[PDB]
Each structure stands twice: as C-alpha cells, then as structure tokens.
Amino acid sequence: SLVVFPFKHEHPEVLLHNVRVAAAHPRVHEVLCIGYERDQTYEAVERAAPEISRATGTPVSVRLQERLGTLRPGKGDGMNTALRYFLEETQWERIHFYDADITSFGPDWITKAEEAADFGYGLVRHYFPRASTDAMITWMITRTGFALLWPHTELSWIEQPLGGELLMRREVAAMLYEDERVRRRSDWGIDTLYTFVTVQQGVSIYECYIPEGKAHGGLDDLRTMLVECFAAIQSLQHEVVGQPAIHRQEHPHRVPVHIAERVGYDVEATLHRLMQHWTPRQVELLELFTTPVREGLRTCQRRPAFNFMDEMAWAATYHVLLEHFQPGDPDWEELLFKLWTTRVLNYTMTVALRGYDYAQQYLYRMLGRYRYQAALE
C-alpha cells in the first residue's frame, strides 16, 4: 500500500510527523510526498527521509509534481503525478491520499480505510464532523451542483466530495489516470473530478467517519478554490450518469463539542470585502440575474445585503452562472465570489445562528429540495 502526501506551503514538522505515522503503519509499504518545488520544506523532508526509512523498514520518497494538466498548476497536478508514480513505478495494490497539513492524523485513518477496502469497495473516502460555517464550498457549490444536475444519482449524497483524504484500488487509480477530463484538472478541481468520475463509472464507494475531524480570515481566502470548484462542476454539466453505484457511509458520531463551537470565518471582514473590488463590468454582468439578486448585489456597492439570497434565489443564481460564468475572466470571478458570499451570509444569519442541529437539518433538506426541483423539470 502506497500513502501519498501532496504539499506546497506546509511547515516541515507537521508533514514529517504524518509521514512517520504512515511509514510506521503495518499495512503501508511506501510513503510518497509530492511537492511543487525544491524549497526549505522539500529539502527537510528529503533529509529526514532516510532516517525514517531505516527506522520503519518502509521506503519514503519525495518527488516534484509534473505539469500533466492544463489549468492553474495546483493540487491536481500533484495528485495526478502521484497516480502516475503509483501506476508506473510500483506494483502496490492500493493508494491513499492525505493532505500534508492535517494535525489530527493517526494510525486509525489508515486502518479504517484498509479494512473498508478489504470489504470490497473500490474507493474509500474519509469524512469528518464540520462546523456549521465550514464547508460552504462543499455545500453551496459542489453538493448543490450535484443535486441540481444529477438528482437521480449518488453524487449529491456523497458527504465530502472535495475531501482529499481517500483510498483507491489500483484499478480505480488506473481508470482516473487514463481519463482525460481528470488529467487536465490540474487545479483545485481535481477532487470534484475524482468524485464525479468514480461515480459515473459505477465504482463502489464507502465513506469512513473520522471522529477526531480534520484540523489544518474573510471568505476571500477561499476565492481561487471557489472559482475552480465551481468551474469543475460547470465543465461537467452536460455529462450523463447512466449506471448506478454502490455507496455506503459509516454512521456518523455526535459532532464533538469543540468542533460544533468553531466559527468558520471572520464575519466583519467578510461584510467589508463584499463592498470591495467592484467594477462597472460586474455591475453590468448582474443584468443576467433575477431581479432580487441583481438588486441585492447592486446594494452591496453601498452596504452589506444578503437577506435576498435564500435557497431558491441561490438555485436561480446557480443556473445563470452555469450558463454564463467564465473561468479566467476577473469580473466573472469576483462576481461569483460576491454572489457566493451573500449566500454564505444569508445562511450564517438565518440558519447557522439557530444552532448546529438546525443547520445540518436545513442543509440536507436543501439538497432534497434541489434534487426534487431538478427531477420535476
């Protein structure tokens, strides 16, 4: 079994700690770290690598990501490079990915995933408890898109379709590595692509619950990620999903108190940013949207406005964006960001303020209404 840690900007100590756990694990035959460039961190892990291999009897390799796709060169190139390495330079039967920066990692993540693979599943995804105001891309972009475009499939039921923590069977990794839609997704869209393509190909999926959760400012920290996750859905929108898929999830535990009691973002800063980086093109682009959204966002030039951006207004908005949004156009990018920000604020003030349980319940029903709306049309 190969374990992969993609990294770029992470501090060395956290990645090295995780490497040491994975290398020590009885079922792990090799650890690979993949980075962007030979920096301080990359050199540190290269230096520390041989002490770790001798101590564990497990080979630890470092490699650079190669340019395999055609978008911004980010996470997708790293993961796809790991797929090639696993397929062409190893004979291991299974590959795990874990983000380099997870601070809650332990032998349990590896064990649970392997045991699920033993059971027969082609793909094992880890999922985690999350704060009511985390996962706003997952919820408002990815799962929403899946519900609205493929309501009869497993896609919108997957818990963490953006999660980078997962295990694949060799054959699943080969299928993804060979798929050109996946190979080209060199940016933040890679996780969406892996998720979508595995489901479309009827790979069987198990979702393991990891109770400790994943420990790793304004909403604008997420803006590139948001743009690329949305572009990934938009790129897939005319695809057909023609076959069922086995999909099961470990029953989740009660959310831990310290996770239920996190705030996901700085509300003040987010309100402020909503009023910034406006341009006449952004103002003119709003003429594509429904009346309450156009007026709501136009208001945002002067003061934060977001009550208008409820569930149905968001679905209406999502449809216009699927049709008109252009990845790489700066005004479209900023507009998406503002529109999503008003959706996040609306949900924060009218749903998340009512409590964790209330929020979870609203989000699941949101998907249910989106699927039903899409299935009736």
The tokens describing 128, both together, are: 């985690």
8 Å CB contact between 124 and 61: no
Among residues 2, 28, 205, 309, the one that binds Na ion under rule CB under 5 A? 28
* 65 assigned binding-site residue: yes
Q: Which does 58 bind (CB under 5 to 8 A by kind): a second copy, Na ion, none?
A: Na ion
Q: Which is nearer to a second copy, 358 or 372 (CB)?
A: 358
Distance in angstroms (rounded) separating the CA atoms of residues 351 and 337: 20
Contact between 86 and a second copy by CB under 8 A: the answer reads no
8 Å CB contact between 198 and 158: no
Distance in angstroms (rounded) separating the CA atoms of residues 133 and 125: 22
Contact between 1 and Na ion by CB under 5 A: the answer reads no
The tokens describing 117, both together, are: 């693979």
Helix, coil or strand: residue 123: strand
Report, in Å, the least distance between residue 225 CB and Na ion: 33
Q: Which residue is nearest to Na ion (CB)?
A: 58
8 Å CB contact between 175 and 181: no
Contact between 324 and a second copy by CB under 8 A: the answer reads no
Distance in angstroms (rounded) separating the CA atoms of residues 55 and 20: 9
Distance in angstroms (rounded) separating the CA atoms of residues 25 and 308: 51
What is residue 288's DSSP assignment? G
Residues forming beta bridges with residue 208, ordered by sequence position: 126
Q: Within 107-136, which residues bind a second copy (CB under 8 A)?
A: 132-133
* 5 assigned binding-site residue: no
Contact between 365 and a second copy by CB under 8 A: the answer reads no
Distance in angstroms (rounded) separating the CA atoms of residues 133 and 372: 25
Q: Which is nearer to a second copy, 91 or 291 (CB)?
A: 291
Q: Which does 93 bind (CB under 5 to 8 A by kind): a second copy, Na ion, none?
A: none
Contact between 347 and a second copy by CB under 8 A: the answer reads no
Contact between 58 and Na ion by CB under 5 A: the answer reads yes
Q: Which is nearer to a second copy, 92 or 308 (CB)?
A: 308
Task: Tell me the CA distances in angstroms from 43 to 7, 23, 49, 172, 268, one per residue in order.
Answer: 12, 19, 10, 32, 39
Distance in angstroms (rounded) separating the CA atoms of residues 154 and 167: 18
Binding mask 131-170 for a second copy (x = CB under 8 A): -xx-------------------------------------
Distance in angstroms (rounded) separating the CA atoms of residues 221 and 242: 37
Contact between 110 and Na ion by CB under 5 A: the answer reads no
Q: Which is nearer to a second copy, 59 or 264 (CB)?
A: 264
Q: Which is nearer to a second copy, 40 or 291 (CB)?
A: 291
Contact between 353 and a second copy by CB under 8 A: the answer reads yes
**In the complex, which residues of this chain contact Na ion (CB under 5 A)?**
28, 58
**In the complex, which residues of this chain contact a second copy (CB under 8 A)?**
132-133, 260-263, 266-268, 271-272, 275, 303-307, 348-350, 352-358
Annotated binding site for (R)-glycerate, which residues?
Answer: 130, 135-138
